[PDB]
Amino acid sequence: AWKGHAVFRNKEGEELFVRRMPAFFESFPVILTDKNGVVKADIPFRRAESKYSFEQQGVTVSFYGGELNGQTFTDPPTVKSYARKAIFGEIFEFDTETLNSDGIFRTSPRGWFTFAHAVFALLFFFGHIWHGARTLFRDVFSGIDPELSPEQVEWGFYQKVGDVTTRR
Amino acid sequence: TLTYDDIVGTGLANKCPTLDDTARGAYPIDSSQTYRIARLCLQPTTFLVKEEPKNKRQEAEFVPTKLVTRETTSLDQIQGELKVNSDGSLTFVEEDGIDFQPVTVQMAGGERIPLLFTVKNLVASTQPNVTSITTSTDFKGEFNVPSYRTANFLDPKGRGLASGYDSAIALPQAKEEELARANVKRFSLTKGQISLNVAKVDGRTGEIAGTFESEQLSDDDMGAHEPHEVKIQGVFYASIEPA
Amino acid sequence: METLKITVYIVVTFFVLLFVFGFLSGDPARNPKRK
Amino acid sequence: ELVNVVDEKLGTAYGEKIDLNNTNIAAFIQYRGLYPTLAKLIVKNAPYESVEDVLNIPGLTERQKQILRENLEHFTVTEVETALVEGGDRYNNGLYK
Amino acid sequence: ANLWERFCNWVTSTDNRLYVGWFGVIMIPTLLAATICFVIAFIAAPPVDIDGIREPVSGSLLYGNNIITGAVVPSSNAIGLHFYPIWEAASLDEWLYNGGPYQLIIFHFLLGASCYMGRQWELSYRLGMRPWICVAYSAPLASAFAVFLIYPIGQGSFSDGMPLGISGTFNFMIVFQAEHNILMHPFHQLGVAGVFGGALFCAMHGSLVTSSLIRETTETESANYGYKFGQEEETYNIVAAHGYFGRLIFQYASFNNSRSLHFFLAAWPVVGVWFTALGISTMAFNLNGFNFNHSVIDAKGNVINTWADIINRANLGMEVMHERNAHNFPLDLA
Amino acid sequence: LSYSLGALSMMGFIATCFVWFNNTVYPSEFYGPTGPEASQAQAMTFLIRDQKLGANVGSAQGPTGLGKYLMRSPTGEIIFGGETMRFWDFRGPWLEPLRGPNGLDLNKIKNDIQPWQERRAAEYMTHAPLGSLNSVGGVATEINSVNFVSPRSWLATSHFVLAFFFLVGHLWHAGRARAAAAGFEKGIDRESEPVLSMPSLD
Amino acid sequence: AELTPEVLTVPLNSEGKTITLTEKQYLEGKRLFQYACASCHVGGITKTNPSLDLRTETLALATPPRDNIEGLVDYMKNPTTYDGEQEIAEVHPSLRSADIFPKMRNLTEKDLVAIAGHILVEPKILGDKWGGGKVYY
Amino acid sequence: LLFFQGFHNWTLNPFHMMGVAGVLGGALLCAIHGATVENTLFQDGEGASTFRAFNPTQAEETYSMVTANRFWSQIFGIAFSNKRWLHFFMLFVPVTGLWMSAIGVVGLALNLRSYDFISQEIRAAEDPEFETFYTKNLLLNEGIRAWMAPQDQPHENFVFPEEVLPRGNAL
Numbered sequence A: 001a002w003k004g005h006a007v008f009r010n011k012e013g014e015e016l017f018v019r020r021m022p023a024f025f026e027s028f029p030v031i032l033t034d035k036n037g038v039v040k041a042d043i044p045f046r047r048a049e050s051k052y053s054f055e056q057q058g059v060t061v062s063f064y065g066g067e068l069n070g071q072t073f074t075d076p077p078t079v080k081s082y083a084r085k086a087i088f089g090e091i092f093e094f095d096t097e098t099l100n101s102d103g104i105f106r107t108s109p110r111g112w113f114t115f116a117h118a119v120f121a122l123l124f125f126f127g128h129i130w131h132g133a134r135t136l137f138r139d140v141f142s143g144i145d146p147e148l149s150p151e152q153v154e155w156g157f158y159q160k161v162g163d164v165t166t167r168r
Numbered sequence B: 001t002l003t004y005d006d007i008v009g010t011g012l013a014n015k016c017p018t019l020d021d022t023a024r025g026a027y028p029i030d031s032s033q034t035y036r037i038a039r040l041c042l043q044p045t046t047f048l049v050k051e052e053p054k055n056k057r058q059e060a061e062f063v064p065t066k067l068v069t070r071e072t073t074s075l076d077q078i079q080g081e082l083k084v085n086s087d088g089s090l091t092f093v094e095e096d097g098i099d100f101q102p103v104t105v106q107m108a109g110g111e112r113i114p115l116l117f118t119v120k121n122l123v124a125s126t127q128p129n130v131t132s133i134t135t136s137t138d139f140k141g142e143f144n145v146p147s148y149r150t151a152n153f154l155d156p157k158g159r160g161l162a163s164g165y166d167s168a169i170a171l172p173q174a175k176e177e178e179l180a181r182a183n184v185k186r187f188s189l190t191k192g193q194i195s196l197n198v199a200k201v202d203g204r205t206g207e208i209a210g211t212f213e214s215e216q217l218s219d220d221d222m223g224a225h226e227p228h229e230v231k232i233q234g235v236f237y238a239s240i241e242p243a
Numbered sequence C: 001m002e003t004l005k006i007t008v009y010i011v012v013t014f015f016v017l018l019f020v021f022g023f024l025s026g027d028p029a030r031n032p033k034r035k
Numbered sequence D: 001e002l003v004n005v006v007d008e009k010l011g012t013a014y015g016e017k018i019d020l021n022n023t024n025i026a027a028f029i030q031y032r033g034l035y036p037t038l039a040k041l042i043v044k045n046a047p048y049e050s051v052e053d054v055l056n057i058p059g060l061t062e063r064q065k066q067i068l069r070e071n072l073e074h075f076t077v078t079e080v081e082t083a084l085v086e087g088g089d090r091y092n093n094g095l096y097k
Numbered sequence E: 001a002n003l004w005e006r007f008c009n010w011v012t013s014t015d016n017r018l019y020v021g022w023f024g025v026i027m028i029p030t031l032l033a034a035t036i037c038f039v040i041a042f043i044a045a046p047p048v049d050i051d052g053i054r055e056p057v058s059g060s061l062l063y064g065n066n067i068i069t070g071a072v073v074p075s076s077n078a079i080g081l082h083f084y085p086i087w088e089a090a091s092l093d094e095w096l097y098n099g100g101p102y103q104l105i106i107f108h109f110l111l112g113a114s115c116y117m118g119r120q121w122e123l124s125y126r127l128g129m130r131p132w133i134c135v136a137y138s139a140p141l142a143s144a145f146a147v148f149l150i151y152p153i154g155q156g157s158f159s160d161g162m163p164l165g166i167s168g169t170f171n172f173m174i175v176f177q178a179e180h181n182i183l184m185h186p187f188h189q190l191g192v193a194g195v196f197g198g199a200l201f202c203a204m205h206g207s208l209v210t211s212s213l214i215r216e217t218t219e220t221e222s223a224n225y226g227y228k229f230g231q232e233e234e235t236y237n238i239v240a241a242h243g244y245f246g247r248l249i250f251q252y253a254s255f256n257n258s259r260s261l262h263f264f265l266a267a268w269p270v271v272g273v274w275f276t277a278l279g280i281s282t283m284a285f286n287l288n289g290f291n292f293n294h295s296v297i298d299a300k301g302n303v304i305n306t307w308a309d310i311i312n313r314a315n316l317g318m319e320v321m322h323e324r325n326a327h328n329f330p331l332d333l334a
Numbered sequence F: 001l002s003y004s005l006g007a008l009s010m011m012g013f014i015a016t017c018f019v020w021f022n023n024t025v026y027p028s029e030f031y032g033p034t035g036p037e038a039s040q041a042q043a044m045t046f047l048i049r050d051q052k053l054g055a056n057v058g059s060a061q062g063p064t065g066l067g068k069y070l071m072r073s074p075t076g077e078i079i080f081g082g083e084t085m086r087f088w089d090f091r092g093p094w095l096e097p098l099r100g101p102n103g104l105d106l107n108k109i110k111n112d113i114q115p116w117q118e119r120r121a122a123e124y125m126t127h128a129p130l131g132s133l134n135s136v137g138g139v140a141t142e143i144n145s146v147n148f149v150s151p152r153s154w155l156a157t158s159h160f161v162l163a164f165f166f167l168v169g170h171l172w173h174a175g176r177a178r179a180a181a182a183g184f185e186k187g188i189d190r191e192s193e194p195v196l197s198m199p200s201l202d
Numbered sequence G: 001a002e003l004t005p006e007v008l009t010v011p012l013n014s015e016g017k018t019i020t021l022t023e024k025q026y027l028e029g030k031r032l033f034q035y036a037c038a039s040c041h042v043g044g045i046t047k048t049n050p051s052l053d054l055r056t057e058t059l060a061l062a063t064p065p066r067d068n069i070e071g072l073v074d075y076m077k078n079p080t081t082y083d084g085e086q087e088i089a090e091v092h093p094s095l096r097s098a099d100i101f102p103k104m105r106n107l108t109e110k111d112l113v114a115i116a117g118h119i120l121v122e123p124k125i126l127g128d129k130w131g132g133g134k135v136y137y
Numbered sequence H: 001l002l003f004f005q006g007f008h009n010w011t012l013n014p015f016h017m018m019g020v021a022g023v024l025g026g027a028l029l030c031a032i033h034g035a036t037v038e039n040t041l042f043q044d045g046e047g048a049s050t051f052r053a054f055n056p057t058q059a060e061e062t063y064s065m066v067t068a069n070r071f072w073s074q075i076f077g078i079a080f081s082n083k084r085w086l087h088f089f090m091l092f093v094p095v096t097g098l099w100m101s102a103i104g105v106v107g108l109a110l111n112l113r114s115y116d117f118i119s120q121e122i123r124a125a126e127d128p129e130f131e132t133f134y135t136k137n138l139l140l141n142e143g144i145r146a147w148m149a150p151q152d153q154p155h156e157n158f159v160f161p162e163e164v165l166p167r168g169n170a171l
């Protein structure tokens, strides 16, 4: 189920937006900006010089739509939990038990299909090169001519590289 | 006498000073003079850990442990006021010193027990009417035991109290509640108890020496598990001064 | 620990001694050509 | 339920003003005249039952007392938080630049 | 002869299935001790307080590691460069806590591999060979000395020597980049040129000779059957190989002298890997990679970043996180 | 030549360690502080600073449980804490006045630190032998500003390189000298190949 | 952008008077700051005491105010703690302790003005990066 | 390189590891083959410089495979005996190596990383005293991402206030 759309606000009633996780990042900080992109709240790492903590900024979260429609949360750990979910975009309730899910993202069929096919396509390039080479060089697969004239491999003996009839 | 280069690497730097077998004197106390301990030294000789039984009808014993952190255990250069009380008892109030050592000992089977061996904020007292400090004098007191790790300490996944992540970031969508104990660091402050049994006194010098035993909790890893009860035994030495 | 130390010291001395006396024992001569 | 006591403290006046009972000493650099001499004295003589009690520190010159007075609106007091005050953390809390 | 002269004859015998030799007499026991300690520690050692901050790091398979995360962990920073043999400890329990196995492994290993190098000189003398194979081996050996001994010495501690494990090695690389900017060090760059070039010329030489094998086998049988062990005639045609390569690039860009060609094959990776070893051994004393941080400035004095500055930003990430509980003061000076 | 090459390589290596660790025949006044010395100076600098601020340096417990400023060596001696624990063997004239029989003396630390000691420790902390090949002084992430590489790093690095190549030179010439004395330095005689006269291995 | 006369105009004294430095003084100031100060104050920070930086706002709240030429020149003669309570010439370089801080021995009054000038101009160019430390590299 | 460490944990990836084996094994094979030829040369000249004692058109091996084989057999325990095998192997090792690294990089095109070991993460999440080199290196990666991203990915307009940056003590 969708939990509904979280809206965050500081103690002034100003609407705040959680900066979303880009795909590049396995983990990502929780930063809330106002509508102009100015930082208004965050989850600090070092606390001793924190200025934008949820506690200090009076951050609350209210939900519209979904399971949590019409609810508002003001307990900082709770508000902080929803904000960590908000870095993933819309927030959902999941059953983590049926499968003993581990909480770590997996790709979809689109990802798995793409990977196997790009890898197989690249390896099939080597296959092409290999068999093309066997085709065009069939005569030398067991080695080169045991008495290949030294004139055809030395320089200036022939006008055209490899052509016996271009002798000088 | 012995200089640093005589002592360095011998083990002696971890040993409290001893008194001769003639040190059996009496150090008189004038209830009109103020005194201090100018140097308290505590050298542990045994660390015992109380076993935790499966049924709490069995009597739990303190069992021997093996020290794995080497000769880094002794508390020293501790000092503080030695008050003469209304009833003639003495009270030591610790003000400062090297008054803690992180220690790790190992149970049979290899369980490692870290503890902050300490007498921080020690307030220790004698029996009343102590006109002299003698080999019959004892001190008994209590002290504080703050968390073995201080508030900045980050666990191996980066999580901490005054710094660090507040969640298990490698499990971005796991459920929080089962991990709360691991994620929310806590800072313990508990009490320990100590007894100092004087066995030697040089009245001519203010020096005393004897045995001690204390009891305190071990590391609880910032709230992650239950601490164990530790019993530390060793020798002590103190130098008392008019001040 | 002391017996361990002494055992190892003896071990090492033995092998070191073999190596030293070994190369002292006419090594240049131990080759297939000019001796 | 388990709580991070430092995050909690950020919800109190400790999160708004210099707390004479808890705040690390480098915070006193934010106002004229407090650091290092008054800051040392404030931290050495803590905790305080109210902000005004800082004026009762033994040995203060008159201008010292006057500097205190001018900066009381910037101070607060909350309960000693053990996690902020242990480890000499008021003197050096492990943060530099 | 006498018992000793028989012993000498055996030790130095050219006929043993594995050559022993005088270097071998030191090599065999040291390498056995290192191997045995290593295997037992990798499987079973308890956690090691590498950084001397009572924060024991688990290296062994039984204590929760796999082949990739597993390691024999460096000895405690509290030890520094002190010699920590088993008899210096109050117990094996203590020895294991403090990372004693690491010192035992790396010391016996370094002595043994040095003797392995001596042994290579030795056998070549017994066999009437020219003597320089051992010199080629001095390159990996120097590199091993760089990360297990010299670096620790410069930095004041075996806790900073390379860990004896896969993930451990990566940890060492990353902290090294933070502290020395090794990538911007020209000796490391020569090292890359050395190993990339070594790979290249390997693929090249392999391919040039193979392409030139003389027809000696049926269309069905492996061409390897076309060469017999010990045969006097050369199994490929070097003139045909040169005819190809000289035309691929240009004539004089190609070797027709097998001897100078094999020399170049020895020299290129060996010299480049010498520079790698010397990179690590000189950053051991904190002479570091080029620093062009904030090197480009505009007319006003605004810093104009370059790719050196983005490198700096990544190095900074490594710096501030590494050994996250070990620093109390603002500069990391070793 | 080869014997001399071996002895020079060895001497080069000794020289590298001499200049890196030794501050008697390489006085820090002229050569700059040793790596250990500079690391010891940083802990001394902050011990001084923080205690000036009111800290009790003896009982201040660091995040790990070891003392933030002071702790014990594995043999019990009082030594500086944080990473510099490794450098506790360092001895230096600006520091020895604080050392008593048990290592660093807390009585002396609390009372006897002279301004010149603060000054030298600040100096040595900020001239640690770290810098880049283009002589930007500092850690590897330091911005350009300070033009410094310690004479100690130059002397250690140069001589490690020299000692190393001399060792190679030794192996090269020793092995060539052996072979030439026995007569096979130019290659294997095709008609008297030693291996052909030996029993096969298996 | 350019190093213009406006960028080079800085407060001379506590009373609002400004002074315009020449490009040559600026360069001189940067050079002499490297020669005598950057070993501890590279980038506007302080290696041996990171609590105190050379930011203009920090300097303004020192006692006496150090956010002007005169204040900085006087600091360089007779340095104090941040509350002006203590004279720290014995452990901080100044003209007064040129005997023990020998690089101070040939700094002229004009040199001191140039360094003060550097310290006041850099944050006008670099902004928060001046005195910011590694976060801002 | 550093982006791949921090973001993809590319050193952990077994396709990169086979790449490394092929490149370092190739370089080893290069050094060792060139050195072996040069040190089992036949004396085919008088010159103390031996380069001139070779003829491109000569029928015979310029070095002794027989002695080379005995030397490695006694030194290392095994040796090549077949020169065609030896050379083919010299082609095979680094070529196969680079091919393997390519496959891993195809994986990284999709963020299909070998980033984590799930069993380590579960133990580490539940046991704050469990630490390995694998956990240590992820803290480095998270430092790299946080500290380099704002200048390395300018179109994201990352503003990371000082308080959010991961950092250990002091540094």
Ligand code: CLA
Residues within 6 Å of the ligand: C008, C009, C011, C012, C013, C015, C016, C020, E025, E026, E027, E029, E030, E033, E083, E084, E085, E086, E087, E103, E104, E105, E107, E108, E111
């Ligand atoms: C070739 C055999 C050999 C060698 C060279 C070593 C070497 C070493 N052992 Mg190992 N060991 C061996 C076999 C060996 N071991 C065997 C068979 C066992 C199982 C019984 C062990 C079990 C063992 C353990 C349990 C330990 C060692 C340790 C050590 C180290 C210190 C030894 C020491 O203090 O010697 C001191 C003895 C001498 C100096 C004797 C030499 C006296 C001669 C007469 C003087 C000549 C020496 C001179 C300087 C140079 C030689 C000549 C040169 C010019 C060519 C060192 C790496 C310790 C270690 O690893 O600590 C980290 C350690 O704890 N060993």
Ligand code: CLA
Residues within 6 Å of the ligand: F008, F009, F011, F012, F013, F015, F016, F018, F019, F155, F156, F159, F162, F163, F166
């Ligand atoms: C590029 C080549 C090069 C250069 C420029 C240097 C330069 C230097 N070397 Mg290195 N060196 C090199 C190659 C080089 N070396 C190689 C290939 C090796 C072997 C690997 C070494 C091995 C080496 C060692 C082992 C040492 C040096 C040292 C030094 C320094 C001092 C040199 C000295 O005083 O010698 C000594 C000079 C002589 C032997 C000549 C005679 C000197 C007389 C006896 C001195 C008289 C003094 C006396 C007070 C006068 C009394 C008069 C009185 C009555 C009034 C100097 C920076 C030293 C050092 O700084 O290392 C950190 C040192 O210990 N070098």
Ligand code: CLA
Residues within 6 Å of the ligand: C012, C015, C016, C019, C023, E026, E111, E114, E115, E117, E118, E119, E121, F002, F003, F006, F007, F009, F010, F170, F171, F173, F174, F175, F177, F178
């Ligand atoms: C990596 C070290 C190393 C290696 C592999 C060699 C190799 C060689 N040496 Mg050199 N040597 C070295 C370093 C080395 N050397 C150094 C630093 C010196 C300066 C003193 C010398 C001085 C030297 C002389 C004077 C001679 C040789 C000779 C030779 C050659 C013949 C074998 C021999 O007599 O060995 C002797 C070996 C040594 C003197 C040192 C070997 C060092 C390694 C590390 C083994 C040490 C094992 C030891 C027993 C372990 C100690 C353990 C400890 C805990 C007690 C051979 C190529 C001989 C030759 O034919 O010259 C042309 C010869 O006459 N060497």
Ligand code: CLA
Residues within 6 Å of the ligand: E173, E195, E196, H001, H002, H004, H005, H009, H010, H011, H016, H018, H019, H020, H023, H024, H097, H098, H101, H102, H103, H105
């Ligand atoms: C022991 C250390 C080590 C080793 C041996 C390697 C080895 C390798 N790495 Mg890894 N690396 C390491 C450590 C290591 N790495 C660490 C610690 C990291 C941090 C995670 C990385 C991060 C890393 C990344 C991010 C990548 C590698 C890649 C590779 C492969 C590159 C192969 C190659 O030659 O491409 C060189 C390029 C080519 C061969 C392409 C063809 C070039 C043509 C022929 C050039 C022609 C030039 C022309 C003539 C013009 C000349 C002009 C002149 C002026 C310049 C190789 C398997 C790459 C890879 O896996 O590729 C699939 C890759 O992308 N590595």
Ligand SMILES: CC(C)=CCC/C(C)=C/CC/C(C)=C/CC/C(C)=C/CC/C(C)=C/CC/C(C)=C/CC/C(C)=C/CC/C(C)=C/CC/C(C)=C/CC1=CC(=O)C(C)=C(C)C1=O
Residues within 6 Å of the ligand: E201, E204, E205, E206, E208, E209, E238, E241, E242, E245, E246, E249, E253, E254, E255, E256, E261
């Ligand atoms: C659209 C239009 C106008 C089209 C017209 C096209 C047209 C007709 C063009 C003609 C005009 C023309 C030529 C224009 C020029 C343009 C131009 C300059 C292009 C060049 C660009 C460029 C960078 C080219 C290539 C650069 C290059 C090849 C660099 C290689 C350098 C290099 C490392 C060389 C190797 C050197 C070396 C010592 C090698 C030996 C090592 C090695 C391979 C050992 C292995 C080995 C070697 C042996 O030797 C033998 C024996 C054996 C056994 C063996 O193991």
Ligand SMILES: CCCCCCCCCCCCCCCC(=O)OC[C@H](CO[C@@H]1O[C@H](CS(=O)(=O)O)[C@@H](O)[C@H](O)[C@H]1O)OC(=O)CCCCCCCCCCCCCCC
Residues within 6 Å of the ligand: E190, E191, E193, E194, E197, E257, E259, E260, E261, E263, E264, E267, E268, E269, E271, E272, E273, H049, H050, H051, H052
């Ligand atoms: C700018 C100012 C200038 C001053 C500064 C100069 C300082 C630099 C000094 C460098 C000079 C070195 C010359 C040595 C030549 C040599 O090796 O002779 C030995 C042979 C003889 O050549 C062979 O010569 C033979 C004739 S003979 O042996 O010389 O008589 C002949 O038979 C054969 O075909 C021919 O190939 O050289 C060769 O085999 C040719 C190719 C190999 C030579 C270069 C490779 C050596 C090291 C590799 C580089 C590693 C660096 C890369 C790091 C990753």
Ligand SMILES: CCCCCCCCCCCCCCCC(=O)OC[C@H](COP(=O)(O)OC[C@@H](O)CO)OC(=O)CCCCCCCCCCCCCCC
Residues within 6 Å of the ligand: E018, E224, H075, H076, H077, H078, H079, H080, H081, H082, H083, H085, H086, H089
């Ligand atoms: C003091 C003694 C030092 C002892 C060291 C012990 C070294 C062990 C040597 C490798 C034995 C395995 C060889 C099997 C294969 C075998 O029997 O090969 C023997 C084979 C013989 O080559 P030939 O030329 O005689 O083969 C004829 C061909 O035409 C095949 O048809 O040698 C090679 O192929 C050389 C290239 C492979 C060399 C690979 C070495 C691999 C290193 C191991 C890497 C993984 C280690 C994992 C760590 C857990």
Ligand SMILES: CCCCCCCCCCCCO[C@@H]1O[C@H](CO)[C@@H](O[C@H]2O[C@H](CO)[C@@H](O)[C@H](O)[C@H]2O)[C@H](O)[C@H]1O
Residues within 6 Å of the ligand: C020, C021, C024, C025, C026, C027, C029, E004, E005, E006, E008, E009
């Ligand atoms: C700690 C290091 C020990 C210090 C000892 C070094 C001092 C030098 C002492 C040299 C005295 C021994 O001298 C040397 O020893 C051995 C064993 O006796 C001799 O004996 C040997 O002779 C010949 C030499 O061709 C060998 O083939 C034979 O196998 C062997 O019996 C050497 O020929 C002799 O030259």
Ligand code: OEX
Residues within 6 Å of the ligand: E051, E077, E155, E159, E160, E175, E179, E322, E323, E326, E332, E333, E334, F083
């Ligand atoms: O230990 Mn391993 O790592 Ca060479 O730097 Mn300092 O110390 Mn620790 O931090 Mn960064």
Ligand SMILES: [Ca+2]
Residues within 6 Å of the ligand: A096, A097, A100, A101
């Ligand atoms: Ca589950």
Ligand SMILES: [Ca+2]
Residues within 6 Å of the ligand: B135, B136, B137, B197, B198, B199
């Ligand atoms: Ca008694």
Ligand SMILES: [Cl-]
Residues within 6 Å of the ligand: E171, E175, E321, E322, E323, E324, H136, H137
């Ligand atoms: Cl790390």
Ligand SMILES: [Cl-]
Residues within 6 Å of the ligand: E326, E327, E328, E329, F081, F082, F083, F084
């Ligand atoms: Cl530190």
Ligand SMILES: [Fe+2]
Residues within 6 Å of the ligand: E205, E209, H033
């Ligand atoms: Fe070949």
